[PDB]
Assembly symmetry: D2
Homo-oligomer: 251 residues x 4
């Protein structure tokens, strides 16, 4: 097993088609012991986490709640063991209200909404790292999810701003994580099926030399599992691109 005898925290599992669900599914197949995180509808989330190959304890974590943080170390240790520590952390949380992304114009999004998105998508990565680093083993790995924000695109708008902030946050999380001997990295994925949206998706498969399947979330789930393993021990504060190679191609 690629992740044999590793304790990994996986956050933001809501559906069975999610990359977050597949990361957990692939990790369990590779011999990893998981601890899962639920945002709000925990009863709804428990029905989905039961489709997973092995049993994993579900913990309540509202990334915006301060009390949920700090208690997000004690609650983890009680689930795994008194002397046992975490070997991996998967941050699969990303949100932006519709005012900030979609049909709504860039200028028409109010700050309160874009602030909510930066908190949940970018700040929360530093928050999760602050709470989980004291209970992490040397050689550990924190993985976040990104969508290449280096260039502006239609509809994505303020979520591109939240992603740019995440990239900067990850570089600083790596500095704090390095003193624990833990790696911090981001996984930039291509479009995942969760008029303009069709144009962006079609463009990706054309640009990607090996092509891109918007319906398949296992190639990105495997990329996260490669970063959670000891096969990338010299990679930190970096972005690993699982987009079929589209970002390196103009046409």
């Amino acid at each position: 097993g690629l992740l044999d005898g590793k304790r990994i925290l996986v956050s933001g599992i809501i559906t069975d088609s999610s990359i977050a669900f597949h990361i957990a599914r692939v990790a369990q197949e590779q011999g990893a012991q998981l601890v899962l995180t639920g945002f709000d509808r925990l009863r709804l989330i428990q029905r989905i986490t039961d489709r997973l190959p092995a049993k994993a304890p579900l913990l309540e974590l509202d990334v915006q709640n301060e009390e949920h943080l700090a208690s997000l170390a004690g609650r983890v240790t009680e689930a795994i063991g008194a002397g046992n520590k975490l070997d991996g952390v998967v941050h699969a949380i990303g949100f932006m209200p519709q005012t900030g992304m979609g049909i709504n114009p860039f200028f028409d999004a109010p700050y309160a909404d874009v602030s909510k998105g930066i908190h949940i998508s970018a700040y929360s990565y530093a928050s999760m790292a602050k709470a989980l680093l004291p209970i992490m083993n040397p050689g550990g790995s924190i993985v976040g999810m990104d969508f290449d924000p280096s260039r502006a695109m239609p509809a994505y708008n303020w979520m591109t701003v939240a992603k740019s902030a995440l990239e900067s946050v990850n570089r600083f999380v790596a500095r704090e994580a390095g003193k624990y001997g833990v790696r911090s990295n981001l996984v930039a994925a291509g479009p995942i099926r969760t008029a303009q949206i069709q144009l962006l998706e079609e463009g990706w498969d054309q640009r990607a030399p090996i092509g891109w399947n918007m319906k398949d979330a296992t190639p990105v789930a495997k990329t996260v599992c490669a970063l959670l393993s000891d096969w990338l021990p010299a990679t930190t504060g970096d972005i690993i691109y699982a987009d079929g190679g589209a970002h390196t191609q103009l046409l």
Copy 2:
């Protein structure tokens, strides 16, 4: 002149040593008609803008105030003329509370403080563009101030995050500005010795912080092939005035680096 017969809005002038003051000073020397922006101390700021080569009207703007942004364009047109429009916009506003940058650890900054910084440093650029684009001429230019956030560095911490957000905002401001035929660009400057920067060197933030900022400034002059003067704010001012002119008409959503070439050098 380089900016002859151009109407430019210059924001965030608080001192006489500021890059924002030196933009306005160089612009007036190049034949530009200015409109200046104030935060809270209106009488105190107007008394700092009297040191400028030519006369320029002052206007109240609190980027956090929605009324101040909605009253804009109208208050600008009344200052310049009924049929006259703006040719340039200078966004020289950047803030982050000390919890987010300095000696305070990255993890110890609360969200409310870092949210205040992103609002004032990154979001405000889109807000100023939203309010001023309808009263801007085709071939116009919106200029913002940046500090290279592509790599993490000590003390900067969350201001680096706010700067990364500004870079992304600038790319989207360019899309909206393009519809008016207006350019939107950022100027990435090297370290500038402000009043706060003179204090953190003097030991106001401690011996640990006083070494970090020194190590950064010394390293910048070494990396820059043409060198870098932390005390001189005119080479960055001139770079902004090149972007406000018609000599860079095919540059949009981009970052122009006035750091002595340090960002392209490892050692």
Copy 3:
């Protein structure tokens, strides 16, 4: 004048349509004293340089010839004056044989041809800087021409590789140029005017769509003006960098 009382060396002025010809035209309008260089057909090049607003001395410069590069500076000083020096240098010589770019597959280009392309497009920038830096004034400027090579595209093939090399060369030229107080920068332009015919069309159409301020493939004056801005004293803190005159297309996905 933006370039008033400045002595600038301009290279690669073969045709009247060239950005190199426009750079010289705009520079002369801004009060600059030029020194021009030709590749081989100096008789035909002199009939082209006669269409420039002001008079400028012609010089023979085969950038592949070592004797021609060693002969530079002396030949330049004799044209301008014994005590006078150069304030600007515009490198506008980019080449790649058709085996390296176009319809011909990437793998089918022989090394001898791509080597010729790297020599003329990338290495020559360092060579021109080596020869002209001792006769350049502090606050001077060396400007090169680029086309964004950060992402692979059809037809450009090995010329994209030669451009990537030029970007790296520019960063090292800046180190040597800094010692003289001279700046070194590149200008990345947008596209300038059946299978190949469709590819280039798809690229040009896409560029005007991506560019928020739009892009005119027929107009070479916005890129010429960008070079002139870099030749002036209005960008004195910019070195080893790439200034993008592409309408903002490189910062836009769609």
Copy 4:
């Protein structure tokens, strides 16, 4: 095994301390069947490759020789089997004469020498891909070695130019490799008046890297190459994976 039942071509093995040597060693430990490449001094390479955990056939490949590149595809097939194909390709070839890198000034390197370096370090990657792609399986991987050329540094001079060219070549190799369903990627490694600048670079690298950097250890970069040769990075192409301890993402 991470590379179980995979046939991988490993080029440029000259010493028992090389990353190329450690890539081959780690791959054999992960269950991979190797085919090795030797430049000229075959008696020296055979001695070094004997120290490897398992047996692997040695093939002669002067990457500058056209006949060697044209006959390579068949010579690999004869070593593995008449019906078998390659699953991985490791390009561990990088050279630049001392005129192009070291104490010698940037301007003083003649073109003939820098041309030799671009041929061996950047062009050869496209040449090796041209020769080996027809005998490669879908889901395959071509891996090259890089040293971050995005910023200029002392001494590395013209080799930084050859590396920038490799990065551009890699993006185009990905286009050709994609047609075969093969991935093409580069691994940017950290360091593995002369001494006064190399020391200042190595010391600075361990300081910048948040997890630190060991200039004496070549196994973390060898493991990174083996991760790219596996099926755990199937959506990565024309990209650069950085095994430098995270130094490239840090200013100080």
